[PDB]
Design a protein around this ligand. Structure first.
Ligand SMILES: O=C(/C=C/c1ccc(/N=N/c2ccccc2)cc1)NO
Ligand SMILES: O=C(/C=C/c1ccc(/N=N/c2ccccc2)cc1)NO
Ligand SMILES: O=C(/C=C/c1ccc(/N=N/c2ccccc2)cc1)NO
Ligand SMILES: O=C(/C=C/c1ccc(/N=N/c2ccccc2)cc1)NO
Ligand SMILES: [K+]
Ligand SMILES: [K+]
Ligand SMILES: [K+]
Ligand SMILES: [K+]
Ligand SMILES: [K+]
Ligand SMILES: [K+]
Ligand SMILES: [K+]
Ligand SMILES: [K+]
Ligand SMILES: [Zn+2]
Ligand SMILES: [Zn+2]
Ligand SMILES: [Zn+2]
Ligand SMILES: [Zn+2]
Lengths: 369, 369, 369, 371
């Protein structure tokens, strides 16, 4: 039991610009605002709560090491890397291609530290120095496919980490479990043809991106059957999420027998998130983390690495993230002060449409060898 | 003919404090934040868009007139009025009662101007000077019952306005249609025994408060049948809302034949709102407004007054509000720049559970004489 | 009689980006920040106080009308106008030339409204519809010379107004009195050879720009003697400023007999300004305004137009501006709540070095015909 | 190429709730509109901390955890009555002002005030007794305006006096110096040690900037403490030349005469060229030279024992570079330019003006009475 924790100051310095989502735009009458939806303060407040709560005293700080060009090229194209260097070199940075993904001047340095934080924690868990950990990285990763930045993501951090373990550590099988509320299309893309990385995405159906995350997207060639999408309807809460964990996610992991589990740990499924419509509470994320850590203990010697994805409530995300940290440390010392306010809103009964969405995926488990 | 518009600078000066929802609290480790969820910038950004878009050139600006004690006592108890001016007269103000509802020293001035904005616009529409209008007030109203402040609401603005229309203008029947995503419990309470003010609330079921808004809440005594709740499931979008408008709301208004329609116009049912889980877009709000305004044209010579309630997306609320203003002016000159991004997310299909929730209410129409 | 007042919502929407002064830059480790020093909220808070104080009920609101190409060319070169059109048309705008003055895409719209606010107010004062007024414009103007943007100024608003007054309003003489704390180098340049616009600048010596504002800069050719710089030492307060008004500025205006006085009204000489080291309080600005308005009454039928320049204290600038507005309206209804706090800090004694700096300018007065 | 340099930051220093006003509270009747960042908002000091980390300076520092100041610690500098009153405000559901109408605190805010004073104490404990050579305690809230019996001017407890008190009573040092270069007069520190020659208190400040009624050169202490308080009031517009002249002519000679066993620096950066709360012209290079001179003095006279403790400073833009310059002088690692250097160097302040010279000359005769 030693739990690694990655925070780098520059994770809080990501420049999301002066827009809300896209850039500010006078002709469209999109007024500038101080905090873009993805502003780094949300994740910084999570870090600061980790410290102020005293959880930091039970964690082993791990320094990020910047990802090299060669590290990035394991997961991404040369053109993509060149384009990110171009944008980062501009005097005020700029949009990276999709119109909602700003990088500041010099912001490539932070993207390298974000991917490198995930890699470094993976490395140190795999040696046995650490039993597990949480890499509280920013910018996020899971939307970025081989040849682009997308959806606030510059490089696919979890895929860079999985690529490292496969290339360097002699790991035959790795699983990436993504519970960010948005479809992990980038991760799905990168490993589409590859059975050596089982990619699972639990998400709100068609939330982002628009035309993806269907359960019929199962990979190709040798990789067919090694991508599992679990699209859930808007309004799904703890009961639906936990049913999905018990009926689909955990059985998939046990069938596949990964040697390492990487969690794309977003908190944008929270009850208070502006960028999705789900009803998960901190206690829901707690139970999700507890189940996944316990699964890792059973099947891969406890080797589990959490890597921050999205989440957009500066108010509530810190308590969602703290719950996961407490499940790693085993020190449960602070309440969720929003518990009683949120518990009365619902989401804790499994609805028939939620049950049916999960049942659609159960047959795909038979094809995991 | 002429459309009134109320904005007062002090609506943007409401001091929501340094907490997120409740106050910042060091022992709970709730870190202070610049913008409380209910910070006035959200509604100020709506006002600024009304101006910057050119909509202000098609509106007649109407100054708020502070609500008198006489005005406030038509909706509220003598003890409540005394208690707010007791609280406002305290050296730094204080707690109105529920732990999420601030008032500053002299913050009664803003509460009076908010209610008075609704009254003054009502007076000018109901007397025939204006055809209709929008009062972009703050603080909001609909959670304040006869004897208390609640859920960010000091006085029940729409009920103060309805009370004025009844007692001063001699209207025999008024309807208040509340499409803020939270249950209008305050409005329901005030008029509970009174068939002369038909109160309708469309809302996310049990979102806030956690214990009201059931469709069994129908009024009492002579008021029985003149309160209609339409609780909707989380995830409901444009399709559910428009189905509710056509199957329940418009028929209720036609059966009742109000001489004035007041709309409690919240935008917290929007797709990007943190404080509910609904999926309405600016186009949904546009169609809701168009339907209600056309109903008013048919049954009460177009006498319709919109009064701002909640809504918590500083990014997207301005476009939701602008769409409603455009339906009043008839000048549709600015695209919603979020439309394509949000359209893909859904909410645009009437789901069986949404339809069933609305169908439960249809039999209640028979009792509206 | 009537006092005109210009505010346009877009003046508050100028996007100053994510840096402090220059852009954020990660190599330099200049961390992004929400409010650039020149963020438009400072001027917006002045506008909001004009309204909240009740001064707006004593003012005649005057809509800004976009400055035309012909208007701009009375102060600037064809090349500069075309370059601003070029930068504003770029997909995400850009650098206007100096590395720090930026325009967003379509930002030319705001620059035209800023200059056009000054023009429209000037027209309506000159015709006698209004006796005087205040144009609370943004972006500012006085650093922009004939052939460039500079120091966050796109067009020289007061020179566009002066040029309009000369060519369209028939005025043979105009004076521009600039009491922004920084040297009005742009205004000086534009009218350098022209005795028909007397240009006066009171400023902190070498504050910005670093190499101009010496009292030896007196114009050339027919314009020799018709530019007057009054550089003052850091730490100069109410005593120095009022002595400079009494000994130099008012005598210059009286000797010149302008038909209109345009004031470049900055408040960055205030006691709490980050971007200069001067000690002027709201009462100092009040007295400067009272004196200049009274001078206008004596020499040009009261024709005086105030046009906003700089000022960077969001806390205190609103009260400095309000004091000027109160001298225009004659309604003195709110105290400066900082009065006692700032009065104790000094600046209210004429120091020998301050007296000496002002006495250096006196011989230049003899040459004004 | 350096010995161990202690550094104190605690997350809660960044969580001090300064409210919704500018200076005093927001006030509707006065028409003081609410604002996100109060002048004294903790982000300014947090931006300094984050630059220490992002610049790589943190790799050359020894992080030292704050230890909460105990009642006994606070009572070496303050009255029992003052300690008791800070508890009450700290219990209020949203906190409140503590006395003077500009000194906001929270429910629980005493926790942070104890951690601020305790950061100064803990660094002092480790520097004295030789574990560390020197250090910087980047604390918040600040200290120097709080006198024996009150909170004042954003200060709850007098952090540097709590540290000096510990050094005197617990470590048994006979002589301590507190050098305060925050731009405002250190009236609280002056008050606490007024009668006491065992703590030499020096304050460089803008004359009558804050408070409005103190900091004259005739305030020299009383009784056995007569001659062991030295004020150097300077005129508005004073810059690097004035401050370095003051260091060379008054401050450093005073320290050499007094022979303190420990030098505590009340390290504010509100004398900077871009500060809203004073009218001085010091640049980061100025603060660099001031720090270099003071550390070298400590090396000469008290075995290098020097503890910097954060006081004021209100430019979130520029303060981090001023603070970083001081940190670089402690580590000897000079890896980042001041990006404002050229912009500010043209503004002046680097020539000694006659009135500046005169203000400093007035104080030189007081050096004769330091025994
Ligand atoms: O955490 C995340 C980020 C998700 C996400 C990112 C960006 C989104 N984009 N929105 C817009 C809005 C308006 C116009 C164009 C695009 C939508 C979702 N996913 O994991
Ligand atoms: O627009 C609205 C918003 C209603 C609303 C009402 C109550 C809320 N309070 N939440 C909390 C959270 C934590 C602790 C106590 C209370 C938050 C939002 N009504 O229309
Ligand atoms: O009110 C004003 C302020 C003008 C002003 C002009 C230029 C400025 N440039 N500042 C920098 C700062 C850092 C690096 C380069 C340049 C900063 C302020 N003019 O009237
Ligand atoms: O760093 C500092 C700043 C001190 C400071 C002290 C007192 C201050 N008082 N401000 C006001 C302003 C308005 C009304 C009452 C009081 C403002 C600043 N001291 O070291
Ligand atoms: K795969
Ligand atoms: K996912
Ligand atoms: K009723
Ligand atoms: K409702
Ligand atoms: K001239
Ligand atoms: K000037
Ligand atoms: K002493
Ligand atoms: K001092
Ligand atoms: Zn996401
Ligand atoms: Zn609501
Ligand atoms: Zn200026
Ligand atoms: Zn200070």
């Amino acid at each position: 039991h030693a739990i690694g924790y990655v925070w780098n100051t520059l994770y809080g310095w990501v420049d999301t610009g002066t827009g809300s989502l896209a850039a500010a735009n006078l002709t469209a009458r999109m007024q500038p605002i101080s905090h873009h939806l993805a502003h780094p303060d949300t994740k910084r407040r999570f870090h600061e709560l980790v410290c102020a709560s005293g959880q930091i005293e039970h964690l082993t700080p791990i320094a990020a090491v910047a990802a090299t060009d060669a590290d990035i090229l394991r997961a991404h194209s040369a053109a993509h890397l060149e384009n990110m260097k171009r944008v980062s070199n501009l005097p005020t940075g700029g949009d990276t291609g999709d119109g909602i993904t700003m990088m500041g001047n010099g912001g490539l340095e932070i993207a390298r530290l974000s991917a490198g934080g995930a890699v470094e924690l993976t490395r140190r868990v795999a040696t046995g120095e650490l039993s597990a950990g949480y890499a509280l990285v920013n910018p996020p990763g899971h939307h970025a496919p081989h040849n682009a930045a997308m959806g606030f993501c510059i490089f696919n951090n979890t895929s860079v980490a999985a690529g490292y373990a496969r290339a360097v550590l002699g790991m035959e099988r790795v699983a990436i479990l993504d519970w960010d509320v948005h479809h992990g299309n980038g991760t799905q893309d990168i490993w589409w043809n590859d059975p050596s990385v089982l990619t699972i995405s639990l998400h709100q159906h068609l939330c982002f991106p628009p035309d993806s995350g269907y359960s019929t997207e199962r990979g190709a060639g040798n990789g067919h059957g090694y991508n599992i999408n679990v699209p859930l309807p808007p309004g799904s809460g703890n009961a639906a999420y936990l049913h999905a964990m018990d009926q689909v996610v955990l059985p998939a992991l046990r069938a596949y027998r990964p040697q390492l589990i990487i969690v794309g740990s977003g908190f944008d499924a929270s009850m208070l998130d502006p960028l999705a419509r789900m009803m998960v509470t901190a206690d829901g994320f707690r139970q999700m983390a507890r189940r996944t850590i316990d699964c890792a203990a059973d099947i891969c010697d406890g080797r589990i690495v959490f890597v921050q994805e999205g989440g957009y409530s500066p108010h509530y995300l810190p308590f969602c993230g703290l719950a996961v940290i407490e499940e790693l440390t085993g020190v449960r010392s602070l309440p969720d002060p929003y518990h009683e306010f949120l518990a009365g809103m619902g989401g804790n009964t499994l609805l028939d449409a939620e049950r049916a969405a999960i049942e659609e995926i159960v047959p795909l488990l038979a094809d995991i060898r």
